[PDB]
Design a binder for this molecule. Structure first.
Ligand code: FYD
Ligand code: FYD
Lengths: 164, 165
């Protein structure tokens, strides 16, 4: 639980616990990103997780926070956004989909994080699967548990990220 | 839920939105609800956007007694995205004990409050009361529906922000 996240000491232990919870839910890859109130500085977000480091670096270098459609979505909504063909509309967004798929990140969802002190973030989780249909079933069967998890991760994470 | 969300989105205005949300809560097992929402950087609880079916006299009293300064769920909501259950432990001060007695007298004895923190800085709460024989039976019931309610509150927030502002 959150209890586990709260008792942990430091960022390494907290990332290992979150990765495990997410793995227990069927997601082998995650990225928890968090910004303080009023910040839009995506290249200096507090980040936890196990996305391939080269993909994280590429995301930063290419400035993909400008193109990633889950980014504009999180600024407008508290609801999850599933990684579906229909969210990638522009040339640049299709390149995005293609580079992210080359990293293994093809199916998944992004849960926006909106903290009590105005923190802005996302918990993105990717699921390994044969097609869209299978990925959807796996994501749907755990969605109530993920929906709680994202809020526990935010409440715990905000303190990890910003309390020094 | 997603059906409910679209119904909320497709609703005509506050009256139909309130009726839909009330019934979602009722179908899930909760008798009374209160959905409250403030815009970014407001602490004017007396003039929040409010939906629901708490007794009118109770709502009036809460406003006249300045209970937004007392109600322990209000401080809680400004500090967390996690639910606060209406446990004896949350009423710490003398004034909070009086608050509990008055809410209880209104029928509002067991329940929980889900903080709402919107994408544009909206601050709110979805509070739901449950009718039950005693606390242990209420808590059993709340634990069985909590994952559904957790989803519900975010749907209600996102739609409600759209209606209110
Ligand atoms: C504070 O942080 C944020 C705040 C509001 C929103 C996002 C965030 C964030 O964390 O954004 C990032 C950052 Br920064 C780096 C990387 Br790498 C990835 C993301 C988020 N996007 C994805 O994970 C995504 C989404 C869809 C398909 C594939 C992917 N994917 O990347 O594979
Ligand atoms: C924008 O609105 C808000 C914004 C951030 C937080 C709360 C709110 C809100 O809606 O606060 C209110 C308001 Br305003 C009026 C009334 Br009446 C009730 C509440 C909420 N409190 C309860 O429902 C509650 C809680 C525990 C025991 C009994 C009760 N109870 O009242 O029976």
């Amino acid at each position: 639980g959150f209890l586990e996240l709260e008792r942990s000491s430091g960022k390494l232990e907290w990332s290992a616990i979150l990765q495990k919870m997410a793995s227990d839910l069927g997601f082998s890859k995650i990225l928890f990103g968090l910004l303080p109130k009023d910040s839009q500085d995506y290249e200096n977000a507090f980040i936890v997780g196990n996305y391939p480091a080269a993909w994280r670096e590429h995301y930063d270098r290419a400035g993909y926070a400008r193109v990633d459609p889950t980014v504009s979505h999180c600024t407008q909504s508290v609801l999850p956004i599933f990684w579906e063909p229909s969210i990638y509309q522009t040339r640049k967004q299709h390149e995005f989909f293609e580079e992210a798929s080359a990293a293994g990140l093809v199916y998944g969802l992004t849960m926006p994080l909106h903290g009590a002190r105005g923190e802005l973030g996302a918990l993105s989780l990717s699921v390994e699967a044969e097609n869209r249909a299978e990925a959807n079933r796996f994501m749907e069967s755990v969605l109530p548990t993920l929906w709680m998890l994202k809020d526990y991760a935010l409440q715990s994470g905000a303190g990890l990220a910003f309390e020094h």
